[PDB]
Amino acid sequence: ATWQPSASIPNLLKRAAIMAEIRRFFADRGVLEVETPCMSQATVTDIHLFPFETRFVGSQGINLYLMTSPEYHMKRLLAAGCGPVFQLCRSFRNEEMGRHHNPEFTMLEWYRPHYDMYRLMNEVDDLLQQVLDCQPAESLSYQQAFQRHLEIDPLSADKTQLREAAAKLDLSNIADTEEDRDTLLQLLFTMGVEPHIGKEKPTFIYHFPASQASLAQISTEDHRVAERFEVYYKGIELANGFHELTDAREQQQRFEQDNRKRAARLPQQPIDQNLLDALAAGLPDCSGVALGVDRLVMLALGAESLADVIAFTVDRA
Amino acid sequence: ATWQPSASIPNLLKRAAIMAEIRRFFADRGVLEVETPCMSQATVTDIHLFPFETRFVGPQGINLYLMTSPEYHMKRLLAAGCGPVFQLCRSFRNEEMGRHHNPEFTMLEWYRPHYDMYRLMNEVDDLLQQVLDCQPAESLSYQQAFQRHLEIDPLSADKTQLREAAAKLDLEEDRDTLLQLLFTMGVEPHIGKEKPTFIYHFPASQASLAQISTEDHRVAERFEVYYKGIELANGFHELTDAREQQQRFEQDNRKRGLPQQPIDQNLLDALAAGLPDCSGVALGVDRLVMLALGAESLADVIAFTVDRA
Ligand SMILES: Nc1ncnc2c1ncn2[C@@H]1O[C@H](COP(=O)(O)O)[C@@H](O)[C@H]1O
Ligand SMILES: Nc1ncnc2c1ncn2[C@@H]1O[C@H](COP(=O)(O)O)[C@@H](O)[C@H]1O
Numbered sequence: 255a256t257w258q259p260s261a262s263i264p265n266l267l268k269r270a271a272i273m274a275e276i277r278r279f280f281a282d283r284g285v286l287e288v289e290t291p292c293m294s295q296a297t298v299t300d301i302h303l304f305p306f307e308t309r310f311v312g313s314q315g316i317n318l319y320l321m322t323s324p325e326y327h328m329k330r331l332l333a334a335g336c337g338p339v340f341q342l343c344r345s346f347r348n349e350e351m352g353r354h355h356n357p358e359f360t361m362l363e364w365y366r367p368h369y370d371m372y373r374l375m376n377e378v379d380d381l382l383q384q385v386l387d388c389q390p391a392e393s394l395s396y397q398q399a400f401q402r403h404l405e406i407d408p409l410s411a412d413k414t415q416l417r418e419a420a421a422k423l424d425l426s427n428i429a430d431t432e433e434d435r436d437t438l439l440q441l442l443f444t445m446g447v448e449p450h451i452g453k454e455k456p457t458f459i460y461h462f463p464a465s466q467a468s469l470a471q472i473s474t475e476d477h478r479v480a481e482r483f484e485v486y487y488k489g490i491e492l493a494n495g496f497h498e499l500t501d502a503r504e505q506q507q508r509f510e511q512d513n514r515k516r517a518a519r520l521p522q523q524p525i526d527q528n529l530l531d532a533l534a535a536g537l538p539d540c541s542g543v544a545l546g547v548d549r550l551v552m553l554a555l556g557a558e559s560l561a562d563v564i565a566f567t568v569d570r571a
Numbered sequence: 572a573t574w575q576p577s578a579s580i581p582n583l584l585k586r587a588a589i590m591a592e593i594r595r596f597f598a599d600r601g602v603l604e605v606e607t608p609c610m611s612q613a614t615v616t617d618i619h620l621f622p623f624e625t626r627f628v629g630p631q632g633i634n635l636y637l638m639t640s641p642e643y644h645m646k647r648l649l650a651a652g653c654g655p656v657f658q659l660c661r662s663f664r665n666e667e668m669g670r671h672h673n674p675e676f677t678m679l680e681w682y683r684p685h686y687d688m689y690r691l692m693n694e695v696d697d698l699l700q701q702v703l704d705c706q707p708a709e710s711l712s713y714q715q716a717f718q719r720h721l722e723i724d725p726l727s728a729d730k731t732q733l734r735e736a737a738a739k740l741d742l743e744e745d746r747d748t749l750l751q752l753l754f755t756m757g758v759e760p761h762i763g764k765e766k767p768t769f770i771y772h773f774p775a776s777q778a779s780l781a782q783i784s785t786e787d788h789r790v791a792e793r794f795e796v797y798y799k800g801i802e803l804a805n806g807f808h809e810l811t812d813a814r815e816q817q818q819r820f821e822q823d824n825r826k827r828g829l830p831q832q833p834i835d836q837n838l839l840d841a842l843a844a845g846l847p848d849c850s851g852v853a854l855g856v857d858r859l860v861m862l863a864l865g866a867e868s869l870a871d872v873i874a875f876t877v878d879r880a
């Protein structure tokens with residue numbers, strides 16, 4: 255019956271125990287928990303993100319946007335001096351329900367002032383070991399991953415070389431006509447690399463190409479890559495971490511470029527001036543990470559979809 | 572500058588300690604924590620509530636409503652066997668920001684199978700004493716509060732009698748609306764001064780989620796807690812009968828120049844399947860934290876209120 259929960263009672267008890275462990279993990283490291291809004295008068299500019307919008311009575315209401323990630327408010331807190339902070343929030347992305355996506359989901363996001371990407375990866379690995387009781391993670395660069403799995407260099411290979419690889423994977427249909435080099439790299443990573451990682455233990459992939467920087471600063475030593483990592487385990491994308499952007503002008507260029515592209519494609523998005531204002535005042539150098547709690551719980555239970563770990567997925571909420 | 576949080580660093584650190592204290596309270600009592608949706612294909616019919624609505628792409632699109640409280644999903648869990656459970660969630664009500672309101676706010680809602688209203692009140696009192704280091708609560712009925720502060724009986728006074736009383740307070744054709752004005756203006760400023768005040772047995776018309784008292788049909792098994800001028804919690808002996816719940820929703824819609832809301836069948840269906848006898852309570856965590864901090868507004872304990880979020 256559609257009235258019943260999506261997840262079993264035993265799975266929801268284990269869910270609460272994991273949430274408690276996560277909280278003990280950060281308590282033990284002196285990391286403060288914060289709560290930030292689920293709604294903003296501003297939204298994100300990323301072309302790949304689709305925000306929920308709702309009207310607030312505010313005689314003239316205010317448009318509000320549900321938060322795809324608590325990043326901007328947490329950076330505002332950091333700029334104001336909160337120190338190392340974590341949050342376990344409900345996040346909202348207007349995406350269809352899938353085995354591994356729900357339009358509302360639990361995010362674990364945290365920030366560590368004065369931590370570089372490597373020190374943060376190590377902390378994420380310790381958390382995985384604790385919750386999953388899994389082995390210590392392996393780490394490799396995006397480059398190394400391609401070289402080991404596909405015998406190509408993704409930082410230097412031309413599109414012909416790229417389609418040669420795609421052909422070997424039985425992917426020529428999609429690859430032959432695709433003329434965007436980075437898009438071909440994503441096809442190859444998804445189809446040629448992802449199936450061969452995260453098997454025995456979690457796998458960190460870091461130094462994604464500059465085009466796939468997302469929230470990451472570009473690597474100063476090699477502008478071809480970004481200070482971003484992603485963790486994979488048993489075929490599941492669990493987390494993305496970054497050496498965060500502290501430069502206001504650089505951040506603003508990102509948003510403006512985003513809205514310029516959206517126009518070329520999508521509505522232009524109300525920029526978070528509050529975030530740019532925080533960066534102008536001064537955000538401590540930091541690395542931050544966003545982890546999918548529902549996926550973590552799914553893996554900890556050996557469950558096969560989010561419907562097993564979320565009380566009511568959107569189809570019956 | 573607008574970029575800065577509403578709440579100070581010290582207040583947020585104290586807020587987190589309180590969150591963890593609430594969790595310790597329930598852990599010590601073996602109550603399970605759950606998480607239920609912030610969004611639903613269904614909504615509420617309650618005449619006092621204004622939800623947010625937002626459009627979902629779907630598996631074409633679907634209208635979603637944000638949750639005003641986790642009640643309906645927690646009842647579904649209860650009907651499925653979850654046992655005593657609490658939740659600390661963000662709840663959503665489409666109403667302007669005020670000193671004591673934000674359109675998104677933290678709710679502590681919990682449910683106790685086999686607790687009556689009195690046993691639940693006692694448990695609320697214990698939590699308040701823990702968080703606030705306040706004195707044990709006093710309790711009185713809606714009737715007693717009107718008798719002690721206004722010298723009238725709200726259960727039997729006629730409208731003339733009521734207007735006379737409103738006249739004496741230096742202040743409408745509905746008797747219940749009259750009672751509401753009297754309570755807000757004549758009773759509320761005069762309770763919760765030195766310790767939390769539990770008001771119980773609200774009139775039948777103000778039943779909200781509560782069963783009617785079987786022993787006196789003029790009143791409901793509902794209580795409200797007030798402290799230092801502020802409304803902190805609402806608790807009920809819960810409705811378990813599907814037929815009665817549905818008639819209440821039908822009536823809700825009748826009373827609604829407000830839009831008519833659909834009745835949530837999943838809730839009714841859970842009630843049909845069987846909801847254990849239980850009492851539940853909804854508490855305003857931000858309000859509670861504000862009182863713990865001796866602060867004046869929610870802007871002092873919420874990292875970013877809506878005006879700057
Ligand atoms: N719709 C969704 N449902 C469940 N988990 C998600 C969803 N979107 C993102 N995630 C998780 O959140 C993490 C952070 O995503 P991002 O903020 O896009 O880097 C991802 O690695 C996923 O584990
Ligand atoms: N907009 C709001 N902002 C902050 N607290 C609220 C808001 N609406 C309701 N509350 C709190 O939530 C409690 C339970 O709500 P209710 O069940 O509607 O009485 C109330 O007693 C208030 O403490």
Ligand SMILES: [Cl-]
Nearest residue numbers: 599600601694
């Ligand atoms: Cl107890």
